[PDB]
Amino acid sequence: AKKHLKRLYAPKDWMLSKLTGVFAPRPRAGPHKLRECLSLLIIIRNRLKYALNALEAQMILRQGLVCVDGKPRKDGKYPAGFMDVVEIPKTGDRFRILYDVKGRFALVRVSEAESSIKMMKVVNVYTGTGRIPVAVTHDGHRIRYPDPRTSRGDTLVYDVKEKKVLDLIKIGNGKVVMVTGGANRGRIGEIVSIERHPGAFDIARLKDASGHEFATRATNIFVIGKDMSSVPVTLPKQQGLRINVIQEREEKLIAAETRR
Amino acid sequence: GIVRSRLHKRKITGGKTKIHRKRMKAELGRLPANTKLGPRRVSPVRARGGNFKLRGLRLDTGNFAWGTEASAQRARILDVVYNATSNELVRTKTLVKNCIVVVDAAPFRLWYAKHYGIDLDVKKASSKLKRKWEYRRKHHKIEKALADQLREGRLLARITSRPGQTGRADGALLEGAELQFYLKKL
Amino acid sequence: RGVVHSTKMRRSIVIRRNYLHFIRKYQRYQKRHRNITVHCSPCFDPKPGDEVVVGQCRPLSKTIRYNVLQVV
RNA sequence: GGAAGUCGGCAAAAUAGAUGCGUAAGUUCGCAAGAAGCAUUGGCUCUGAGGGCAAUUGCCAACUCAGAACUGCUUACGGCGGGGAAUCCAACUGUAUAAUU
RNA sequence: AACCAUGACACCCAUGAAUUGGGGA
RNA sequence: CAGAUACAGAAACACGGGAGCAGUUCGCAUGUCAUGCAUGGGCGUCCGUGAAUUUUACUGUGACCAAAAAGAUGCGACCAAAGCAGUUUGCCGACUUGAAUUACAAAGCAUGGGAUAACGAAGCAUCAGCCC
RNA sequence: GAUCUGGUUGAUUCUGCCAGUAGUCAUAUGCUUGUUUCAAGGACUUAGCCAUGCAUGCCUCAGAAUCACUGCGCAGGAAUCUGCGCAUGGCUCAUUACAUCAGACGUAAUCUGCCGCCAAAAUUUUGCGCAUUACUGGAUAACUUGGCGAAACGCCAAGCUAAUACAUGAACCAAUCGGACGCUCUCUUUGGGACGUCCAGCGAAUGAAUGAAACCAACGCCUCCGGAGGCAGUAACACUCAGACGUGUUGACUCAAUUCAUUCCGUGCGAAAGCCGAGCUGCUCGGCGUCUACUGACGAACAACUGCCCUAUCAGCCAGUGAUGGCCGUGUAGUGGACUGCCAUGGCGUUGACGGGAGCGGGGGAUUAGGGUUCGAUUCCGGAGAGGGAGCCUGAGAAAUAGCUACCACUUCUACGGAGGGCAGCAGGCGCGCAAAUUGCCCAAUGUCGAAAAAAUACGAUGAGGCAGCGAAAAGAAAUAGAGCCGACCGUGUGGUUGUUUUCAAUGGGGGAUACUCAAACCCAUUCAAUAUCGAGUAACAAUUGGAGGACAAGUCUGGUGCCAGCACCCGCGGUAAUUCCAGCUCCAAAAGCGUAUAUUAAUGCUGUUGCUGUUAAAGGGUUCGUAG
């Protein structure tokens, strides 16, 4: 029943200065968790500098200019998370919320056709009154009649402008995933195997594109496609490939030197 | 008020718990119901998270099921006959879960004659029903321990609800070794 | 896991857990222990001195919080 | 009102049965101890525990203890310790001037 | 000043004359 | 070649609600009152059932970990204590950054088996070929 | 930086403690202080007592306006009703050791407004009198008419009128599916079909079923009117639909979900019987608002594996009246000895229970060869409280203090009948003490609440929050002068130097804007012409605080006192020549700073795990046996 959020207690990925104000906007309940999201006021005022103060974001959001799932949103503290399309029809730009190679939020400009597509991760499958199989999704959507082959770990390709399911991508070794939590967030790799551990957390072993190996809990992977090429959505710049820290420092140093 | 916390009990070592903080509302209790037998009266209790419970005071009749025949029927409660917590609960004519009561059994005599054609309005019957009874009669049998009870018009049953919680008195007839348990017990 | 210590109750036993605690300053260990009471169904039959595996439950009493599986 | 009476609380008043709890200094470790002190107690209608003999059933005997609901008091035969803190003497039970010790 | 003012168990450690008890030549 | 000796998480027996059309390796015909517009020699999968069926501490590498503070990677805020920002010999813009760490003990996947400690035994308390 | 020095003897080598020494966002007091940047600030003692003022409310195009309200029917709308919030924030640390808290985990034992996806086929109603089909009812505020009462967040009666307050109630035209009957009709030999009647929506309670996967007699089919095969094929179901589920989920379910039987009466269910834009009584399109059912998120409560100072001049603790477990029960949202009845005799402890002392936990600070010692009221997270202590209403959520009720201690007004008060919120006062700031400005930023974007014929609140005043707690930069000239020189062998005259530039303390900042003011940062703008020379724009026997840098200087006065942290000095007192002159340290007091860290191998000592300096038990370890 808390209603505030102190600055120091806010997530670090919002990158709010500790010398500017004492409070942060608390995200209202909704599609995504408080820790794993960033609000609409943050995006409008901090990522793209459309608005300077927080009163100006109201002058944009209360008019319904900004849309987040094909429906305009007027609440600044709306929680927006992974794989979400943000479009401002007046300005004509559309972004998709993804994780960059360092586990931070990334907004990548998408095409017109892409902006109508969204990927969802199944989390639960149950039966309604009567016999209605409905599957819950990582962003909270409920799908009324999915493919009878859908299960917990798979993913769904969803059309947002008109509500129907495009295709279902199951789980298996061949597919390519993206890690969505655990300090390996933002890496793309293939499924080498998955370990069971009944009653506890499954461990999925993955192989990077550059031949590296990494592991994480099976509840942190979001299967994108059956191959790197066959990705329904766009990808960030690095394509989720992490390289050595000393090499990063050296490349940055020489690049600054050639630049000037 | 009444409290359900553990701050007043003794530790397993026998030590005495020192209490800081005052009493809280989340662990409150409430006084019981002591549901009697008679004309129906209930009171509404406002529970946690909206909602209401039916504090049953002097319920009269309820729905009693017949497991072997997969049937149920509405019947009246005559008197409480047995309790396991205490004898004092029987004397006060209180109703709680798992009491052993007595019921009229007149409705159940109606159902059996209608379903099977055996009476312990039968001659008036269509030929389709007059042929269906023999079908059921061939593959179904009944026990003397319950045939005698229906003849006497008094059936033993047991409560299967929480009258101080849901405000009803439902139950089921006693069949088999369980019935023979209480027959010897009385 | 633990060692069955006492079986004087009814459908209930006491198990002992022995472990070692490391003090940083002296770079050495020391024996400790903890006692835990659990519920034991009549399928099993443990004697004092055996080893048992116990899994968590919902509060079944003032102290009982574990249930016995696979006496050995 | 409460020992102001009187040499002196003399005489009177006062405590009181039973049950549950609780009980100090001192000590020769046995006691002191019923220390001190607190609570309950009627009537009526019920419930439980405590046994014997014949073939699980039947029949039969003794009043004791514990518990509950309702109901009532004008505190209501007889019989039945007042208590505590100290000083002097004699260790103690006992005997002993029938007729003033 | 119950004192060797010298806790108990185990290992290594240079020489020469004596002494108490058992054993071998 | 097989089998036979050792070893084995593993071995035998089954599941078509089991491997997005029952994995991998040596278009006539059925149906047509049809949207029937449909179907056209071993390994390794999966799930159950019986033989079998060792555990801990220590060490390597991963998993899992609010910020502020602390170490630090980059940038003359005139320096510094700071703060994450800022730089173009100019326009209706460009490059963008904000790295990466740690953690009393306990906890969790998997590697070795040297030093360790927890069980068992007290040996006549034991006797048990295999195949056809 | 892995450091040491003075005091036991006539001298020496030791043990050992006293004293010295460096820090401390560590407190206080003394002396002294030009500029600027960043900053803690009534915890310590008395969770002591408090005058006065303010701190939580909200209106859009979109619940409800006949203000005897205002502006030229239209607008703005005072006031009240209705909806949401006020359980957040802020302050303090009194209580507190199987408690709280930290790391790891759970709820298959539960509740959950606002928020996100999303669902809805039950209901015989209204007008006309049998044809039609959502223009439904009553009351109550605000107001005015009398008023009562010394007050007082005091209160009475009468007369009006609204709803997104309250209360009724919708056949229409709306599918699919299944049970029970009739002694109603038809056919052939439950047979089957039909016709009629009753029940069949979401949610709840009770009971039954599913919740899988390890040779004949009846029915189907074929072959050759009726009258005879004998098994090729063949998911099933007597037509209206020849596949309209033979397949939920979990690591695991008495869970999800389906069919059947008997039942819900207020303690549940709408198409708000509604609010704005348009477009064309009479229709179409678009923004809104609200009941009920379901599962995600923000949460709430509960269980808890491991860990956390000193004390044995604290050794046993727990059971009438719950202590440890069992059985049906009751209460709760839910499990539970949380609680009633009955039953058993258990549970904890030298691996320190029980009792006592200090104390809010943690993230972290100080000191740092390494190991450690110590502090943590305080800004982030968690818990708890609102003078003392208990109960409870309304809420989804409170056992709430700017909610109510009572008692206990202090306390205010009064007409003596009565009525009130709660600063450990903001600023301020008394007292207490060694000890701690203005009765300021603002919603510009950061956020919360809301019926709200901003703009107008039309400005939401907010001592949360921010800004400035006081402020050597502490921390970062940094002025108090730079070059030469001419004599007088000083030492050394001609090259720095020490005063005496005297120019010659430079710059800020100081003061002023074309002005910047600012929510408005202030401080920084710019600048003394851009035609066009003030200023050191005994630089009176003047640096202090401690010392000069040793430890320990610095006088065998000059006066005064005479074991007095005094210094001296320790050793010591002072009895007429004081290297130590009181002074003058020089000098030393560090400097806008520097002394003193108390506590604490390093010095300390003087607490020793790394790493001490025990013949004689303090210290081996009188000797054996012996259990836990």
Ligand SMILES: [K+]
């Ligand atoms: K006495």
Ligand SMILES: [K+]
């Ligand atoms: K000898």
Ligand SMILES: [K+]
């Ligand atoms: K309160």
Ligand SMILES: [K+]
């Ligand atoms: K104050």
Ligand SMILES: [K+]
């Ligand atoms: K000066």
Ligand SMILES: [K+]
């Ligand atoms: K002097």
Ligand SMILES: [K+]
């Ligand atoms: K020493």
Ligand SMILES: [Mg+2]
């Ligand atoms: Mg009943």
Ligand SMILES: [Mg+2]
């Ligand atoms: Mg007299």
Ligand SMILES: [Mg+2]
């Ligand atoms: Mg007398």
Ligand SMILES: [Mg+2]
């Ligand atoms: Mg005594």
Ligand SMILES: [Mg+2]
């Ligand atoms: Mg007595």
Ligand SMILES: [Mg+2]
């Ligand atoms: Mg005598």
Ligand SMILES: [Mg+2]
């Ligand atoms: Mg005599």
Ligand SMILES: [Mg+2]
């Ligand atoms: Mg930092």
Ligand SMILES: [Mg+2]
């Ligand atoms: Mg000496």
